[PDB]
Amino acid sequence: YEHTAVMPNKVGIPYKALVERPGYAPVHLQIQLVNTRIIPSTNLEYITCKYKTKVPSPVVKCCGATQCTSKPHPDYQCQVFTGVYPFMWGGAYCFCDTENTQMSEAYVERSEECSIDHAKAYKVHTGTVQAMVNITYGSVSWRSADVYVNGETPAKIGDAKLIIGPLSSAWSPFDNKVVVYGHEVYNYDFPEYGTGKAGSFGDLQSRTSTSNDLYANTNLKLQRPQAGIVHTPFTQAPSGFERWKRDKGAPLNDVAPFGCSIALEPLRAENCAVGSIPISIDIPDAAFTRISETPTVSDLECKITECTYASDFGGIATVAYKSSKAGNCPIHSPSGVAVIKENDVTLAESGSFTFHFSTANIHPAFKLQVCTSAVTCKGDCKPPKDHIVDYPAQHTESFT
Amino acid sequence: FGDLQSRTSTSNDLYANTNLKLQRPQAGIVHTPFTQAPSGFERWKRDKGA
Amino acid sequence: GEGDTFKGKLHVPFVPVKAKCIATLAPEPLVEHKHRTLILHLHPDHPTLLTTRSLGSDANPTRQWIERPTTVNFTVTGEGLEYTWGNHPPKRVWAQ
Amino acid sequence: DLDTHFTQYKLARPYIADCPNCGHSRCDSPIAIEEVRGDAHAGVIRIQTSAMFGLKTDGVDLAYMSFMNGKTQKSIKIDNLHVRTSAPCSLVSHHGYYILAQCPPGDTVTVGFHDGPNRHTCTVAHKVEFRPVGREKYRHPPEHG
Amino acid sequence: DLDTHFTQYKLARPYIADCPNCGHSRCDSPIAIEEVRGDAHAGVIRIQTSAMFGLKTDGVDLAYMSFMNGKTQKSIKIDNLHVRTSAPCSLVSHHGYYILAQCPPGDTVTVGFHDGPNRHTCTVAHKVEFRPVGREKYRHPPEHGVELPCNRYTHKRADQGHYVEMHQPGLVADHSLLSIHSAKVKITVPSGAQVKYYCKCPDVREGITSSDHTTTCTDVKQCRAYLIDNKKWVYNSGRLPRGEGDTFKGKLHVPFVPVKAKCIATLAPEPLVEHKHRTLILHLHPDHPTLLTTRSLGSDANPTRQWIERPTTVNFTVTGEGLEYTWGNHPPKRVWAQ
Ligand SMILES: *[C@@H]1O[C@H](CO)[C@@H](O[C@@H]2O[C@H](CO)[C@@H](O[C@@H]3O[C@H](CO)[C@@H](O)[C@H](O)[C@@H]3O)[C@H](O)[C@H]2NC(C)=O)[C@H](O)[C@H]1NC(C)=O
Ligand SMILES: *[C@@H]1O[C@H](CO)[C@@H](O)[C@H](O)[C@H]1NC(C)=O
Ligand SMILES: *[C@@H]1O[C@H](CO)[C@@H](O)[C@H](O)[C@H]1NC(C)=O
């Protein structure tokens, strides 16, 4: 009843296995993986965005110098100039010709746009993956279970209880350093907090949008106003966040192999088809029925009708059933050579019922198990010319 | 080239394989947005050989 | 003013917000199939970048802005291939 | 409900400053601009002009602008408030020192109203570009998509 | 003379449609732009607006225009009509729904009149390039040069080369018909026009009437407020609904048919010729990119053509069979060698 089985990690591929429960009628299984969310553990480092040089009003003493003070503003650059003769619309601003000094100061403050648009640095750990599994086994034909991958957590939705994982591959598309920009994910190597070079990425680094303090290395340097005019000419490197926005690499959600996609989320990488899962399930004995009730289907034969050497269910075959009673009968091929989309067939008195399947061998010689009745369906297949189907469901490529 | 072909200037019959597909109208606005390949004759009119 | 910086903290009138603008859509490419290779016959109206990404172990990605009409090819392996032409939704593909 | 912003409306007054390229030279225009925020996507630009348009002298006439001429302010009509780039722009909304308008890409942004006997324009050098959101690097908001 | 085209004049009436970028957003401007035709050589553009430019109410006032303001039109002057692109254009002629102008090159096209208290303009994203006639990739028509057989729209309008269908317009909603009869929603009529009418609630189901009242429904946002007004016909625009009754005929002539005129084309500065044994050396000083082509007259053509923008000096191996070359649109020249 406890059917342990390793399962390839694919999303849209069934796992219609058969339980070889002694003393009772065998019961088919069916497992499907809707999602394979990874959700690695993450830790935010800092957020960067364009800055705004909030330059306050200059201090202009008409006759006399004025020493500046080292204010605690981030990147607070202050410098005093000498020998200035400012005009304004009302005429020349002072009667002195050399004692005129200007005290110009400027500091870098994060732009108002940081509230909506801002990159997010992230350092990630291994984390723990989760999946949504649908199991339509036996006669219940339904499940809707969210499950983990740790090899301890039971999942007991409906009547059955099972355990999943751990995954055979520790492959994580995320690197140790991950940068998230609004909706797309880039595995850019942000240097560290409080060390960004001016002009490059992370010129302005804030711990959090709420955090008041930040790290603004913009190489801001004021210079003398020209021709006696009241303003604050400041020379600084162009916004480093503006750069790398128009020349960033391909997002991770567009270069991650194994067909894995990301989202503005706990950063799950869903549909990351890689490795296998050691699935173990405990079927309740209630679903089991006495073996003495299943009709006998011995002395039957299998005939191939038309097999296509393709990925979709192009293979068909007719089975000459030789039964005694009437009832349901699970069908399954223990061999991985062929996969049968058909799940259950009712048996009449010495009837014949076609079924569909798919294979990957030119001359498929696969065993067919029909409610405790073995038969080999040997035949031939033909490759298709119009290779236009859904994604392959045979998942059985090997030597042919 | 030859995206639209007519047997003569007066010919009421013609061939036009231009991949014209209609699109859903945007924001409950009354219009007929269509997704259309660029004019085939405009191509080869900028990059015709000698 | 040498005296003091008076109060009068004034709200920014037009605060940037994350609205939803309407963006352009490139014409759908003309898909032509060959044996284990995908030919994308396409004609871009404006410079659009297309991205391709193999579903196998090795991504082998390729990003390429294209402006003039061009014909491109792609070796679609048994693992499969997916491509994103413009801002259209991504599409995947098989191999036999 | 436009009377809940009197802190901007009443506590502030029109202002005048060094326009770098006021007309043919660097005069001291009443609409000297500063901190143009051309960082959106849909081609819209926020401009902080020295002149503070909004309500009239006391509490009315949202459709009037108030600049400072000489010692005194002067609330007049807003007839020809012009914002220009490489191509002429189109106004959207204005409030206090800030006026919201959308412009085509260009190398300089100019602002100018009309007193009626006077031009009173001002401009500044500032890169303006607008890349639309998405993978299709277009240059004008399309009809559909 | 000018009153010999009444098929369009009286029988058609301008309507309102959904401009992509009216003013600042997607409004419903009366000058909605359709079918920007930038195919002429000299940068001439035809625009088909939903507003009818040309004659007054009956037959007069070429210097007037007629647009539709809500459920009724109001013909005014053409005082400040302006068509604009990257740089402001210069209008040439207006007739019916069509405007002819000469625009600078640019990526967007705008059309806008000026009522006097409001602008009421519209614009659409549609690039307009310049394609200089010949082999000389100039940017504006020069004051001199050799003329070439260009293709260009004609300023004339009295032509019958092409037609466009003008069916009964579809009906239009006007919620301002839906006044209140103190407690019920109440519908007036423009001039006895057909008011299609019905609400969510069960009441009068067709509406072919004078001013009705509602018996059942109460909300003006839960009734059909329509006007079938096909006493005057409208263009077969893709922005108006089509009345399911039937599609009227009444096709009217297109104002500006393309013609094979003759535009002036630029003439590149002449080359400075220099020579060595069996070897032409060619000095070129182009002002604008101009195609140079060369062709050997021997058995092997051995062609060579290249756009040249920066001033350059090139060479050519001249065999005794001789060599031809065609700098710009200057007549081709040919040579022998020693
Ligand atoms: C769990 O996995 C099984 C096996 O893949 C899912 O079975 C499939 O369920 C769909 C409906 O979700 C069936 O198709 C639909 O059937 C209805 C009713 O006949 C029909 O109106 C629709 O047009 C559509 O054909 C489908 O036949 C069935 N089996 C297969 C082989 O696909 C099941 O839905 C999954 N359960 C959950 C909760 O996700
Ligand atoms: C792509 O396929 C076409 C098919 O005609 C072929 O001509 C062309 O050389 C191929 N291009 C490449 C880069 O293989
Ligand atoms: C000939 O061509 C060369 C380039 O191949 C050029 O530099 C040179 O000035 C020309 N003059 C002669 C030597 O004929």
Please give the span between the terminal C-alpha atoms of chain A, in angstroms, as a whole number.
35
Q: What amino acid is encoded at D13 in this protein?
A: R
Beta strands in A154-244 (DSSP E): 161-163, 177-181, 184-186, 204-206, 214-216, 221-222, 234-235
Cα angle C59, C62, C66; round to 5? 160
| Structural contact between residues A279 and A4, judged by C-beta atoms closer than 8 angstroms | yes
CB-CB neighbours of A1 under 10 Å? 14
Short-list A395, A173, A391, A369, CA closest to A269 = A173
- A54 and D CB contact within 8 Å: no
Q: What amino acid is encoded at A252 in this protein?
A: L
- Residues with Cβ within 8 Å of residue D118, at least 6 apart in sequence: none
Query: Residue E156 has which token pair?
Result: 């004339």
User: Left, alpha or beta for A385 (phi > 0: left; psi -120 to 50: alpha)?
Assistant: alpha
Chains adjacent to D (≥3 CB pairs closer than 8 angstroms): A, B, C, E
Bridge-based pairing state of the strands E82-84 and E106-112: antiparallel
Short-list A217, A212, A393, A227, CA closest to A313 = A393
| Structural contact between residues A119 and A47, judged by C-beta atoms closer than 8 angstroms | yes
Q: How far is B32 from chain E (nearest CA, A)?
A: 6
Q: How far is B38 from chain D (nearest CA, A)?
A: 15
| Structural contact between residues A334 and A369, judged by C-beta atoms closer than 8 angstroms | yes
State in Å: Cα A141 to ligand 1 middle: 9
Dihedral over Cα of C12, C17, C22, C26: its sign = positive
Continuous segment of H or E residues that includes residue D7: helix D6-9
Query: Residue D23 has which token pair?
Result: 């007309």
Q: Is D17 helix (H, G, I), strand (E, B) or coil?
A: coil
- Residue A36 CB burial class (10 angstroms; 0-12, 13-18, ≥19): buried
Q: What amino acid is encoded at E12 in this protein?
A: A
Q: Which residue of E has its CA nearest to B29?
A: E18
Q: How far is E82 from chain D (nearest CA, A)?
A: 13
- Residues with Cβ within 8 Å of residue A152, at least 6 apart in sequence: A163
Cβ–Cβ of C27/B23 closer than 8 Å? no
| Structural contact between residues A108 and A218, judged by C-beta atoms closer than 8 angstroms | yes
Pocket residue to mutate for ligand 2, from C35, C39, C72, C76, most atoms within 8 A of Cβ: C39
| Structural contact between residues A143 and A135, judged by C-beta atoms closer than 8 angstroms | yes
| Structural contact between residues E94 and E78, judged by C-beta atoms closer than 8 angstroms | yes
- CB-based contacts of B30-34 (< 8 A; 24+ apart in sequence): B30/E17, B30/E18, B30/E239, B30/E240, B30/E241, B31/D143, B31/D144, B31/E18, B31/E238, B31/E239, B32/E238, B32/E239, B33/D143, B33/D144, B33/D145
State in Å: Cα A278 to ligand 2 middle: 45
- CB-based contacts of E57-65 (< 8 A; 24+ apart in sequence): E58/E10, E59/E3, E59/E6, E59/E9, E59/E10, E62/E2, E65/E94, E65/E113
Continuous segment of H or E residues that includes residue D107: strand D106-112
| Structural contact between residues E103 and E127, judged by C-beta atoms closer than 8 angstroms | no
DSSP state of A257: T
Q: Is E175 helix (H, G, I), strand (E, B) or coil?
A: helix
Task: Report the DSSP beta bridge partners of residue E194.
Answer: E228
Cβ–Cβ of B36/C27 closer than 8 Å? yes
- D70 and B CB contact within 8 Å: no
DSSP state of A115: G
Short-list D76, D97, D89, D74, CA closest to D17 = D97
User: Left, alpha or beta for E326 (phi > 0: left; psi -120 to 50: alpha)?
Assistant: beta
Bridge-based pairing state of the strands A145-148 and A130-135: antiparallel
Within 1-50 of B, beta carbons closer than 8 Å to C belong to: 19, 21, 23, 26-27, 35-38, 43, 47
Cβ of residue C72 lying under 6 Å from some atom of ligand 2:
no
Query: Residue E297 has which token pair?
Result: 């007259």
Q: What is the DSSP string of B17-49?
A: ----EE-PPSTT-----EE-PPPTTTTTTSS--
State in Å: Cα C39 to ligand 2 middle: 8
Structure's resolution in angstroms: 3.8
Query: Residue D1 has which token pair?
Result: 């409900």
| Structural contact between residues E97 and E113, judged by C-beta atoms closer than 8 angstroms | no
Query: Residue D96 has which token pair?
Result: 């206090």
DSSP state of E168: P
Separation of alpha carbons A118 and A112, rounded Å: 11
Separation of alpha carbons E151 and E260, rounded Å: 5
Separation of alpha carbons E21 and D144, rounded Å: 11
- Residues with Cβ within 8 Å of residue E331, at least 6 apart in sequence: none
Q: Is A178 helix (H, G, I), strand (E, B) or coil?
A: strand
Residue from E26, E41, E234 whose CB has the most chain B CBs within 10 Å, to mutate: E26
| Structural contact between residues A78 and A69, judged by C-beta atoms closer than 8 angstroms | yes
Short-list A132, A140, A153, A128, CA closest to A32 = A132
Separation of alpha carbons E199 and E224, rounded Å: 6
- Residues with Cβ within 8 Å of residue D104, at least 6 apart in sequence: D43, D85, D86, D87, D89, E86, E108
DSSP state of A248: -
Query: Residue A384 has which token pair?
Result: 């298709």
State in Å: Cα E316 to ligand 3 middle: 9
- What's the number of CA atoms in the CB half-sphere (13 Å) around residue D8? 20
- What dihedral do alpha carbons A108, A111, A117, A121 form, nearest 10°? 20
Query: Residue C86 has which token pair?
Result: 């413009």
Q: What amino acid is encoded at A133 in this protein?
A: V
Query: Residue E7 has which token pair?
Result: 């098929």
Cα angle E204, E206, E209; round to 5? 85
Cβ–Cβ of A50/D35 closer than 8 Å? no
| Residue for token pair 């084309």 | E265
| Residue for token pair 């989760």 | A130
Q: Is D123 helix (H, G, I), strand (E, B) or coil?
A: strand
Q: Which residues of E touch B30 (CB under 8 A)?
A: 17-18, 239-241
Short-list D110, D104, D108, D111, CA closest to D127 = D108
| Structural contact between residues A128 and A39, judged by C-beta atoms closer than 8 angstroms | yes
Q: What amino acid is encoded at E330 in this protein?
A: H
Separation of alpha carbons A187 and A180, rounded Å: 8
- Residues with Cβ within 8 Å of residue A113, at least 6 apart in sequence: A49, A50, C16, D37, D39
Q: Is E220 helix (H, G, I), strand (E, B) or coil?
A: helix
Task: Report the DSSP beta bridge partners of residue E282.
Answer: E273, E314
| Structural contact between residues A302 and A322, judged by C-beta atoms closer than 8 angstroms | no
Separation of alpha carbons B30 and E237, rounded Å: 11
CB-CB neighbours of E89 under 10 Å? 23
Q: Which residues of B touch D145 (CB under 8 A)?
A: 26, 33
Q: What amino acid is encoded at E78 in this protein?
A: I
Q: Where are the alpha helices (DSSP H) in E48-193?
A: none
Cβ–Cβ of C16/A117 closer than 8 Å? yes
User: Left, alpha or beta for D54 (phi > 0: left; psi -120 to 50: alpha)?
Assistant: left
What proportions of chain D, in percent to the nearest 5, are helix, strand and coil? 5, 40, 55
